[PDB]
């Protein structure tokens, strides 16, 4: 299970996958999950950690993309930058 150390040792496909590892429980099976949760919360300097991962729903595109997308909109409007590429 990868993590990273920054958001920036990883790309947005990497992040999208990271999110999708959590939306997959692709992990140690409850732990790495809570930790990949927190690695999101950590990584992106993002406002809504607990709230761009599962609770977002009712007009809120929290699809395993849309959530990464939610960052892609905070990190785009806040202009964050700071992922990788490929």
UniProtKB/Swiss-Prot annotation:
GO cellular component, as recorded: protein-containing complex
Q: What InterPro entries does the record tag this protein with?
A: Colicin_E_sf, Colicin_pyocin
Q: Which UniProt keywords apply?
A: Bacteriocin immunity, Plasmid
The record's listing under Gene3D superfamilies reads: Colicin E immunity protein (1.10.1200.20)
One GO BP annotation of this record: bacteriocin immunity
Q: Which GO terms describe its molecular function?
A: protein domain specific binding; toxic substance binding
The record's annotation in Pfam families points to: Colicin_Pyocin
Give the family, as the similarity comment puts it: Belongs to the colicins ColE2/ColE8/ColE9 and pyocins S1/S2 family.
> What exactly does this protein do?
This protein is able to protect a cell, which harbors the plasmid ColE9 encoding colicin E9, against colicin E9, it binds specifically to the DNase-type colicin and inhibits its bactericidal activity.
Q: Name the chain's protein.
A: Colicin-E9 immunity protein
Look up and give the organism this protein is from: Escherichia coli
What gene does this protein come from?
imm
